[PDB]
Design a protein around this nucleic acid. Sequence first.
RNA 1: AGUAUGAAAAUGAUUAUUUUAUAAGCAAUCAUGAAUAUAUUAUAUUAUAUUAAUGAUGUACCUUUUGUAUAAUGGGUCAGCAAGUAAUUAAUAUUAGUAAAACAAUAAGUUAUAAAUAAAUAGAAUAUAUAUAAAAAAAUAUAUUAAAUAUUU
RNA 2: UAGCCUUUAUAAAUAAUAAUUAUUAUAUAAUAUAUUAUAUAAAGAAUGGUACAGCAAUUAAUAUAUAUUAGGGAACUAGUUUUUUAAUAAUAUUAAAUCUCGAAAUAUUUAAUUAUAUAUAAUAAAGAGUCAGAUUAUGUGCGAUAAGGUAAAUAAUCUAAAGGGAAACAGCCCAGAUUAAGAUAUAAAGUUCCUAAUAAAUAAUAAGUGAAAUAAAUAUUAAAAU
RNA 3: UAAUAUUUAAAAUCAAAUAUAUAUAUAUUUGUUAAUAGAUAAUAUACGGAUCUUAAUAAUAAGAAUUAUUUAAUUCCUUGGAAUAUUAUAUUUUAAAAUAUAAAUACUGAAUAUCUAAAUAUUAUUAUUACUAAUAAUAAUAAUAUGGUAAUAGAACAUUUAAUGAUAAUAUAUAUUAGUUAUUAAUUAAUAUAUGUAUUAAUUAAAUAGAGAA
RNA 4: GAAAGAAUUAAAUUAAUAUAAUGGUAUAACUGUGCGAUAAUUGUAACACAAACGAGUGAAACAAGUACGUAAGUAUGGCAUAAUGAACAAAUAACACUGAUUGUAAAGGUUAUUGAUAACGAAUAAAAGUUACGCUAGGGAAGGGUAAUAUAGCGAAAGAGUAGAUAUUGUAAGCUAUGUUUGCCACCUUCGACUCAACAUUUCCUCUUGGUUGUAAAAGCUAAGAAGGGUUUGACUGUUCGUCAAUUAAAAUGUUACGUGAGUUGGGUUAAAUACGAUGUGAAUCAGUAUGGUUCCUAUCUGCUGAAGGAAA
Lengths: 82, 118
Amino acid sequence: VFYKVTLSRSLIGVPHTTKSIVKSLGLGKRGSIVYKKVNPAIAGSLAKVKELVKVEVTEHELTPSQQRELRKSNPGFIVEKR
Amino acid sequence: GLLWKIPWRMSTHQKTRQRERLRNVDQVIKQLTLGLHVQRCQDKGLTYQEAMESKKKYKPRSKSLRLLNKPSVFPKENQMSSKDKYWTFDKKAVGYRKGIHKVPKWTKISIRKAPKFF
RNA sequence: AGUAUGAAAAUGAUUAUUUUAUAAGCAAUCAUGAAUAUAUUAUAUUAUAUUAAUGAUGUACCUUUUGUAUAAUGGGUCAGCAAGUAAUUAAUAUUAGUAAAACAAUAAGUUAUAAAUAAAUAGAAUAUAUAUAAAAAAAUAUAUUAAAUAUUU
RNA sequence: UAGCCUUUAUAAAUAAUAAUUAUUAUAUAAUAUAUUAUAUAAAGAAUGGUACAGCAAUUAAUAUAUAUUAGGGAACUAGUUUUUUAAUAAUAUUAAAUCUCGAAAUAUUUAAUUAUAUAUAAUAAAGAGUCAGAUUAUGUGCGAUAAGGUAAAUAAUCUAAAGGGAAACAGCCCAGAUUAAGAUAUAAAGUUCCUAAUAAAUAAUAAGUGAAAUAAAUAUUAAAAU
RNA sequence: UAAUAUUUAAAAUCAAAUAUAUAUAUAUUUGUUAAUAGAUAAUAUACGGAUCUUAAUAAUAAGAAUUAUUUAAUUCCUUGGAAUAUUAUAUUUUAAAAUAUAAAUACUGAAUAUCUAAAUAUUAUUAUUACUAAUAAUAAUAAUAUGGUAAUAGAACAUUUAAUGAUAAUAUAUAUUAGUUAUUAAUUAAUAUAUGUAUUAAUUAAAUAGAGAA
RNA sequence: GAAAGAAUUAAAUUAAUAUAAUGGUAUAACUGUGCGAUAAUUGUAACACAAACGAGUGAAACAAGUACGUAAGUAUGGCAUAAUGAACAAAUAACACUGAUUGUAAAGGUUAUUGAUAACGAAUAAAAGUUACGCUAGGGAAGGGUAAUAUAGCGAAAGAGUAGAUAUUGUAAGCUAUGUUUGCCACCUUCGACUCAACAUUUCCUCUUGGUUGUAAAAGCUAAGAAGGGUUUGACUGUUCGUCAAUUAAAAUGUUACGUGAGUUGGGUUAAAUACGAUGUGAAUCAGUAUGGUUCCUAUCUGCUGAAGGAAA
Ligand SMILES: [Mg+2]
Ligand SMILES: [Mg+2]
Ligand SMILES: [Mg+2]
Ligand SMILES: [Mg+2]
Ligand SMILES: [Mg+2]
Ligand SMILES: [Mg+2]
Ligand SMILES: [Mg+2]
Ligand SMILES: [Mg+2]
Ligand SMILES: [Mg+2]
Ligand SMILES: [Mg+2]
Ligand SMILES: [Mg+2]
Ligand SMILES: [Mg+2]
Ligand SMILES: [Mg+2]
Ligand SMILES: [Mg+2]
Ligand SMILES: [Mg+2]
Ligand SMILES: [Mg+2]
Ligand SMILES: [Mg+2]
Ligand SMILES: [Mg+2]
Ligand SMILES: [Mg+2]
Ligand SMILES: [Mg+2]
Ligand SMILES: [Mg+2]
Ligand SMILES: [Mg+2]
Ligand SMILES: [Mg+2]
Ligand SMILES: [Mg+2]
Ligand SMILES: [Mg+2]
Ligand SMILES: [Mg+2]
Ligand SMILES: [Mg+2]
Ligand SMILES: [Mg+2]
Ligand SMILES: [Mg+2]
Ligand SMILES: [Mg+2]
Ligand SMILES: [Mg+2]
Ligand SMILES: [Mg+2]
């Protein structure tokens, strides 16, 4: 099992301890998404910054590349070279 | 002196937003707990779906999470009172109360349990 | 204050295009009609350029400040001139030359090649051996140093 | 000078940051009244004396047809009773910057584990700038629980931060602008028009109360509950 | 049920909900007044302003823009489904009735995030081009980063002088206008003025090397 | 069942601690006693705490000697935290370290010790005033905030009022409003007179009204509405103010940079002269007194008073 953790609020204006925590969590920027293995420590960490973060449990994680692929919009065209 | 035009009440919209935020916080906690439970299940020797199904879901052991789960310490939004969603206990106000929206970073800060009689 | 030349700007008059006599504020930016000008591919239902219909947005610039639209400093405009340089040294770095030597090679000298001590006639085999200092018969103890089939630092 | 910043680099380098495990008890199961495993509860290794809470000791305050110690006044024949005066004792109640017997959270903080390595720490060789800060919120001292006052503490922002909101706005609320583009999520704030965007439900208000800066004691009128 | 004297309470009590064994018990959570007066100064009313409180008879139609508690039609069960209702549309049937469909994801809102391209730097993968090829140049893919005063670091351009140096009046230099290249610069075309013509391109060396701030 | 011993438990604690306050302390550091005057000794001190540096603090261990102790051991002064001062220049001893031609010396050094810079990181061995005759560089390293005081108002009502709190009065305490006083803060660097006034209402007069054993009337007192009109001339003083005089229906209180100095004046008031009193040794000084005594401006824009031209009627 994995947590999908998103930074939904900016760290700007938040006490430095909390910023540090967020950094540790591997969350770089607002809207950034991380997939973390579920162990108690991680959960505890997340609890502390709960008001900054949106979490959801998922079956499997995703590599950044996969995520990117998922994101990509549908280009509504098929090229043909002539 | 310098005019900080901030009202003593909140607009309905603001209140709604606050409520939503509260709900979201609760949801995060719930999700965390769920994740922990499913991890436990997996450790024991079950599938993901099976874990999800399970009647006897495991409570969390870590202190903080447990405390959060307790509604005495950290109420959920439906449980919570009107008087605590939109006001905090101020030790130096008139009525010993103050609109939450006055609290510095109220949009990030969580603060549910005011004192028992205040 | 040489002689030529001079479509450099600020500044004045005038003419053309355009906008302007019910409209209010750094005079711009973005949106957006209309009018005019030019264009040897405007084929046009064209393209550029100019122009304060009209709408939205928009507290000059510097300085000094906790902080300036400030009714704090400074400037009438334009043109020209106006401010981190040199000498003699020292220490670090980078690259090049040479290298257990380097520079200079007339002889000197400078730095490196041995650490230490106020100074003195003292001074180097994994360290637990050794060197110097305080101490001492000699060790210990403290500090710093040197020391590991080979080719010295 | 240290603190905060930068450049180059070093490694028998993960030391850095964050959390978790660590304790106590209950139930169940298994081994020898003990040990392990699983579950559950408990503000859950160690450090602490603020809030709160308390009146113990210390320092203060109150009340007794209570008890004792003496005194003042009083009756009858020095003894006696009552009315007390103060002190001490008893019982009850109370508070405090320099009282804490109970006692939080936040905090300091340890080893291992997990996560952060396009990451953090340490060290080496070089450089700086800064040493009249401001506001907001919280807990204070000074002031008069005055000040856009003053002095420090903690956090943020401003300083050095443009953007959206707060009518206008350094310091508030959100959010950190490499350059565009403008389809999709949105933050704080809003949705009759000005002005981008709205429809509902249940109550209350009749004063324009109120509608982004709440003015007090008190009085009147009504409404509920007993 | 009238009058009667307080209180403005969910602590207690009752009701409802959630968690534990569970039709009960235990523990936790939530639910208890409103007007008016009091009310007040000097350029001008001062919610930012307009303005906002609804009503039969009639509108394919308004009904707070205030205060309190809420929702994203309303109700139930556990994001979903169902029912109910509403609106809109279509078709059939006699302006109605029946059938089917859709809507129920409220919306706006930043220079936030994503998408969509572009630039730069770094880390990790490539592809092409050319004999520290373990390199360089260019192009991809994934990721992270790109506000900034004092300050530190790195890289360029303009101007002028010295070293080297082709070329040419169809050339050059300077100017104006319109183009071009991610553009303090240079280049293209037309035009005007020089000038028998670069201290010209480029690499070095240097600087009286860049001005709205005295 | 008794005696004795060993004790143990409770209370220990504000006694005592060389000395303030705090923390500690009976397992005693507190007290008594034997021995001893020795650890109130000598070289190396790692490593910590603390910390800008200079400094400070605890301290294991190694070596040399000493004291007490049967022994284990304990002692590098004091139960802990204050009890202090750099370098430089002098001075005294030890060291055998250099000895400017050599030898001696002198002089310097090493080790140990001495006296102070209390403005206590100490500018020199050695240092006070005044300037209104002053000058240079700079900085700002009445308004705004507050409302303690002031004024004004309310709520409650002790008490006055020939009786009776509430006609009229209204202690001390309460709750407010104003920003007209005296202050506080440090964002920011002139009083009067004349002229002209504009605005406010918490109304002095005039208009309407309620209460008034304290409205017989007339005069009043007090309160509500009301800002339309009006609200003074002299002697004194620089005065605003204030004391009088004469009037008046009344001679209200403010705000306007305590309105108005690019509109006037300059009497007061912060310069140069001089004098008096006071203070100072003196230069000089003053919450003193007195005579004299210095700024100017043609109006660009806003605005206002008038007067035209253009214009879309
Ligand atoms: Mg403001
Ligand atoms: Mg500004
Ligand atoms: Mg000027
Ligand atoms: Mg420095
Ligand atoms: Mg305290
Ligand atoms: Mg200083
Ligand atoms: Mg301040
Ligand atoms: Mg600054
Ligand atoms: Mg900003
Ligand atoms: Mg910042
Ligand atoms: Mg950015
Ligand atoms: Mg209103
Ligand atoms: Mg208001
Ligand atoms: Mg007004
Ligand atoms: Mg409004
Ligand atoms: Mg962005
Ligand atoms: Mg940058
Ligand atoms: Mg120059
Ligand atoms: Mg110039
Ligand atoms: Mg410039
Ligand atoms: Mg004591
Ligand atoms: Mg002793
Ligand atoms: Mg030190
Ligand atoms: Mg001195
Ligand atoms: Mg001194
Ligand atoms: Mg002196
Ligand atoms: Mg003042
Ligand atoms: Mg004022
Ligand atoms: Mg009146
Ligand atoms: Mg004037
Ligand atoms: Mg003037
Ligand atoms: Mg004369």
